[PDB]
Amino acid sequence: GPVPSRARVYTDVNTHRPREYWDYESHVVEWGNQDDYQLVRKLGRGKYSEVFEAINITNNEKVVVKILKPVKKKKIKREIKILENLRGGPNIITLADIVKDPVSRTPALVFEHVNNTDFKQLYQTLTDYDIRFYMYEILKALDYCHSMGIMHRDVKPHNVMIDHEHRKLRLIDWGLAEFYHPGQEYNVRVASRYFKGPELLVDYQMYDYSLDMWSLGCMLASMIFRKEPFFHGHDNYDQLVRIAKVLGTEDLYDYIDKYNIELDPRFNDILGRHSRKRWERFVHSENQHLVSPEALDFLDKLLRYDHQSRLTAREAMEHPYFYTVVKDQAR
Numbered sequence: 001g002p003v004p005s006r007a008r009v010y011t012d013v014n015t016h017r018p019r020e021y022w023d024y025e026s027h028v029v030e031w032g033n034q035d036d037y038q039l040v041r042k043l044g045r046g047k048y049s050e051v052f053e054a055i056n057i058t059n060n061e062k063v064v065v066k067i068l069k070p071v072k073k074k075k076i077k078r079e080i081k082i083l084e085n086l087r088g089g090p091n092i093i094t095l096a097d098i099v100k101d102p103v104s105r106t107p108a109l110v111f112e113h114v115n116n117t118d119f120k121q122l123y124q125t126l127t128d129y130d131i132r133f134y135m136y137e138i139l140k141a142l143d144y145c146h147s148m149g150i151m152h153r154d155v156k157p158h159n160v161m162i163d164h165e166h167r168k169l170r171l172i173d174w175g176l177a178e179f180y181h182p183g184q185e186y187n188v189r190v191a192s193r194y195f196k197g198p199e200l201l202v203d204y205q206m207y208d209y210s211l212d213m214w215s216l217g218c219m220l221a222s223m224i225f226r227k228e229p230f231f232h233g234h235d236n237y238d239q240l241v242r243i244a245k246v247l248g249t250e251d252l253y254d255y256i257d258k259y260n261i262e263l264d265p266r267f268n269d270i271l272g273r274h275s276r277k278r279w280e281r282f283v284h285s286e287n288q289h290l291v292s293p294e295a296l297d298f299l300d301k302l303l304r305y306d307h308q309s310r311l312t313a314r315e316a317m318e319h320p321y322f323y324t325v326v327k328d329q330a331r
């Protein structure tokens, strides 16, 4: 069958932890008092939850309440445990409280309020410096969570809150995140289509932190090239075709060979034969102000088929793309 794989970094971080850290099935939830919060207005809804601005009446603080739609106890425990383990880390959203919603007997997560600038509207205003700065801020959250033995597995613009006035960023929605254990076969049916790594699309289960770095590369491409989404597949199969038309089919088949991956036969007559394209075909008069040699070198080193060859978060932070930002933060 397939060749096994291990994270290059932070490989054994959870093995050295007490069992309780990662064994979320055993976690005992510390409930709080629902009557401390009053809902103010609805912010949005998804498959998994509805989100409200709210107020803590005991201190008149603004907070956000995420009312969970019914999922397994295990899934709720995993998100809670991860949020608690990561709490206080750089640019990690703060979980303030957990309450049992009386209406449905449903749990509600209570988060710190971030004054988020419009995500669709924000992108239209971002300069070259802003993209570098916010990318660096996301990398601080990813290096932290990876170093803590956790893969996010759903990195995308919707899950990055930006309070632009305060140059403040938070990585949110830890509902798909998981603990990394060497040898563990993970569920490939994760993340948003446009951000799925090749490992997911070819059904390679022994993946790791490096998944997040593919998703990040997809974000970077969409920002510097003004192309949202960058890899626009019609479904999961066509998503790999879209990637192959850019990264080329030679490297794809090399990856499949290296890991002895069994390719779904549906791929066979759709992948075809594609050259690896130069990034320069995506540069044009309206985006060129966002694109540098540095940006393209960095992007190239995130967007690799082989999960093992992508930059780590910590390596990415040392790339020349960030030298100006690093200098500015020291001062």
Ligand SMILES: O=C(O)c1ccc2cc1OCCOCCNc1ccn3ncc-2c3n1
Pocket (backbone or CB within 6 Å): 043, 044, 051, 064, 066, 093, 111, 112, 113, 114, 115, 116, 161, 172, 173, 174
């Ligand atoms: O799932 C979480 O971990 C999550 C945590 C915090 C917030 C949202 C979350 O995800 C729901 C996304 O809904 C977007 C609604 N807009 C706003 C506006 C302001 N804030 N401040 C915090 C959040 C927020 N959401």
